[PDB]
Design a protein around this ligand. Structure first.
Ligand SMILES: OC[C@H]1O[C@@](CO)(O[C@H]2O[C@H](CO)[C@@H](O)[C@H](O)[C@H]2O)[C@@H](O)[C@@H]1O
Lengths: 185, 185
């Protein structure tokens, strides 16, 4: 028969995006080791992480189709994680200011008879930022929650000059590619 | 940019099946010491073997799209390999005689930004075979280099009553599904 759909992520943004497909699903997550391999490229690491998150849940629901995903913000081969302290979030934002960075989101779809994993990369260009903007933004507490210390939605939007790629992928889920992949499941 | 296509397989049938896509590609020979792990189902093992073959070549040629495949012949959960002795061939054929078995073929497609693995299962039903038929067929030496001790082409074609699935997958490569998957690469 057909298989039930599962989203192995508690990300609010991924939920609103997958809801666009109008395909019923449940959200089920099982924590996994997320320490990245020093010898993997960012492209290899982000796909590996999406793959692990999906597989942990697929192991618990072998008759389902499980979607795992992961997003990284990388600057000059170096990727920025979520800031621990405000001065770190501030340090990240100062680094992103006035230049471009890459946002890479991987998606892994797992089922017993078919698996597929891919990444989608988007170039994000920032206007030059000032300390006031940086700290004002930091106060909102929005940065303290995402990789690279910013979100393209809400107030972070004012920082973005332009993107070359997929806005939805920057939010956390390349929805058109995900929908296209699911047709073959 | 596009990516060159590579078939990680020495199988003549797979080469002739991939030729139907009329896509340019090369074949790369690889020594891969891969074995089944007893804690996997035939479905998990065949997909794992196909992925290892593709990955062994993809690791060496990261810019390409690599295709790996593997086929297993299974009877009631137990899968048959090639008979290293004619008396075994006759043994396998007798098991296969007058009943149905499963031919499971997995395909794995690997690229730096996208990977996909799946299996295709086909039910193959045999006519009740006679000792004469069986032995006479073995004397042809055709079933001695084939998993399950038979081939759906050549004289073995005379043993098959019908299939429910994909004839090309039984030969070693589900071509239509492979072509369809490649469209997303
Ligand atoms: O079957 C040849 C195939 O094996 C590889 C390893 O996968 O290389 C092996 O065989 C070569 C040719 O005989 C040797 O030169 C080499 O040292 C050995 O590893 C592939 O490179 C080759 O295509």
């Amino acid at each position: 028969m057909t298989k039930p759909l599962i989203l192995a992520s508690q990300s609010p943004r991924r939920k609103e995006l997958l809801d666009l497909l109008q395909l019923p699903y449940s959200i089920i997550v099982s924590e996994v080791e997320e320490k990245l391999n020093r010898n993997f490229s960012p492209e290899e690491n982000v796909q590996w992480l999406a793959k692990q998150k999906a597989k942990a849940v697929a192991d618990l629901h072998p008759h389902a189709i499980v979607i795992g995903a992961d997003t990284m913000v990388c600057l000059d081969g170096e990727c920025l994680g979520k800031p621990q302290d405000q001065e770190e979030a501030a340090s990240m934002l100062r680094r992103l200011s006035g230049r471009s960075h890459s946002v890479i989101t991987a998606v892994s779809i797992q089922a017993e008879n078919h698996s597929e994993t891919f990444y989608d990369k988007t170039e994000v260009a920032f206007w030059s930022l000032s300390e006031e903007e940086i700290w004002t933004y930091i106060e909102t507490k929005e940065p303290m929650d995402k990789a690279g210390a910013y979100g393209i939605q809400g107030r972070g939007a004012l920082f973005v000059k332009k993107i070359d790629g997929d806005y939805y992928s920057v939010m956390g889920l390349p929805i058109s590619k995900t929908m296209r992949a699911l047709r073959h499941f």
